[PDB]
């Protein structure tokens, strides 16, 4: 039975274990090894968890950053109880009116039980004001009635039990450069050089230049200008192979030390990747497709059976003014004033680090003294010791120790920057990993979006093996989990077949009659059963159950994406939800955009500012695949302003096309609230584009919902790849209430534009530090450093806050006249 476990782990991750086995790797063998038995003892520490305590396992609270209806019922019988509580009151004193009720009904304690939110895995529990949790929140703006279904304890255990599986050498250190076979048209050569992170450890030194028909031979030695004690644990030889009369053809890095800390003898074959000189950054492990990448065999001189100094044997071996790059007089000065830096400046530790001399072990020696005795930083300061200008193993183990105290809802923010961080790492064994993968055994939200991070890009050979593993280590945490991602991957894989259909039939033959096809092929009985009753990727509290084939259909444009809706008879309307399967584009930048504007959301909130964003979930699934989440009764911009006749919204003048539709859909008194969420959200969506840098914002990339709040999608530019600020006049004219003078009604929307820009700019260290480490995904508009600099000034945070005001209103008072 062991087998099958594996059997659909390999189908799930997708890719075979026994290609694991296949490497016979030392490295990948401790590490299946070792995180099988620690996520199994995370398992069993799981299921000690008490049944209030699986709660918060398996269903986190969703809190968000004068009286209501509320209906509440029992799993037993269908029958119901409509209830009037305040949004004060405990979710304790609900389930004791629901108790008392069933008394009274049913012949004659609330700490027994727990309140679920109908058809969703969401569950209502704690010391917390109906109001803190975000279902009653969406219920109280939407005018719905929250609908909880009392679960006594018994039931909650039986869901528990139910998911059950030296300095000696001092001599210069040196390679031999011996062969390797490429391919090119002219001369070639080899650079090689040595980096602690980002910057050399010495200069970097080339080959001789060798005909370019080769497959060569050099059996040339490079001789590097540092000693070899005093080559850091963290050292990188990076080659660099290229043609000469410059292009470049290849690169390739390496660690001088295993993950057993032996310094490595002898010859090496470095299967190369691909290049666009030197590249520190790359991954450390070769070119998986041997057949095809060029090799590059060298050889490591045997100085001896060393390993590096054990930490026990380390340990025994004008500033505030430049407090905000520095002058090299002034790196002397905070390196000798460095113990005056542990005293009274703790988090000026990525300073101190950057001026510590990594290429002589004397230095770091005296700097990971004063680390191992270095007071505790904040999680903002932990962020940026994660960077891969930071690559000594104890400094981002030390980081990792100042994330511990990050909170469930503090990690799903950071997660996505977390996982790419993984890319930077030497070894497949490392803290950030256990950490992932510890936080992920203990919250089954995260642990959700922790997989699908790593299966999306399992298509990537240079993270397919350490993604892999990761992921199998889970599954080892929770089998029954890792069943219900894998009805998640048989769905998403029925609809890119779908989707595969639809491309081809709808080229072939008219929309109706392709929409008619998707749905024939939609009721096939293995479509049924794959896309329906599952945990939506997007959010795995919402349950897609019955899948309505007949309210599916897709989009005329070009990747054809999908639409597609459910249904539950045990949610109601909270059921009625949909996803959007695209496939075909590289949905990271909407994700990283997204979680951005859901981070200034909450933000913005936690200050007391409710800017009623529509922060819409995306999730990359695949290789340019993945989903996004329906937003329900909304409309684009542009089909809107299509001013369709026949209808509601008709205008005498475009100018209230778009005015027209609110009031159609907001009758009466109910408009007056509609433009305010317009206003609202048009501070902020604008504000946030701004910041961002996201150009090309028309009116087929912003749509709006019946409620009044404007939203933006479709997010493939942000960056600048410099965008002015963008004010269109008919959104103008619905602030205004369609009068063409309304200045205090525009002037608060001023109001609201400028605060929130000047909470974000409060902020704008976090918003550094986090797109810092995206920077290893890799994406095209995050790669250089000239794309963070854009939100440096975007933010002016190396200006003063009403400095920055004063000039945010000049490019405001340029965006109001091209209106
Ligand atoms: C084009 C369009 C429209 F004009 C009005 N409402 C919705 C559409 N529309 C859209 C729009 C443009 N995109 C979105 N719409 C909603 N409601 N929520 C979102 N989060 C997004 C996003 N991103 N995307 C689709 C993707 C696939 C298939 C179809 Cl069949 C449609 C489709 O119809």
Redesign the pocket.
Known sequence: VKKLINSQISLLIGKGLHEFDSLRDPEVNDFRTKMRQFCEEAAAHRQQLGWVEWLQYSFPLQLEPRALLVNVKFEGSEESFTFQVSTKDMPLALMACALRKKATVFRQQPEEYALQVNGRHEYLYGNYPLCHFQYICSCLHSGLTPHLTMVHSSSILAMRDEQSNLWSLEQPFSIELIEGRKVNAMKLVVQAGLFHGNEMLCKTVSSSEVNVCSEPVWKQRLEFDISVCDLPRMARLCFALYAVVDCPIAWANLMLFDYKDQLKTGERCLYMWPSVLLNPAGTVRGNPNTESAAALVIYLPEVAPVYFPALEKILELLREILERELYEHEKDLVWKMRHEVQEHFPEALARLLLVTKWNKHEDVAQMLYLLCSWPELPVLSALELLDFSFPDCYVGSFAIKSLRKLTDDELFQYLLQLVQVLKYESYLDCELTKFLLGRALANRKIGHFLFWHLRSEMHVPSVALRFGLIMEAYCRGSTHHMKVLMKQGEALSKLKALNDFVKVSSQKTTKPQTKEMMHMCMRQETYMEALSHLQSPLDPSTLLEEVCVEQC???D?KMK???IMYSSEEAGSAGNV?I???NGDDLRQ?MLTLQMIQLMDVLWKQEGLDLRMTP?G?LPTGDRTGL?????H???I??IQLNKSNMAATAAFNKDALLNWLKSKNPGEALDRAIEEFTLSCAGYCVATYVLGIGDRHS??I?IRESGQLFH??FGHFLGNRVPFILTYDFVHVIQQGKTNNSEKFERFRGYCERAYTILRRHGLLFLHLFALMRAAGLPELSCSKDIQYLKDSLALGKTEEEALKHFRVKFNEALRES
């Open positions: 259909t897709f989009m444009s994406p999908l639409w949909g959007i399967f695209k909407d819409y995306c996004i989440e329906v937003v329900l909304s409309d684009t542009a089909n087929d990339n749509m999608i479709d």
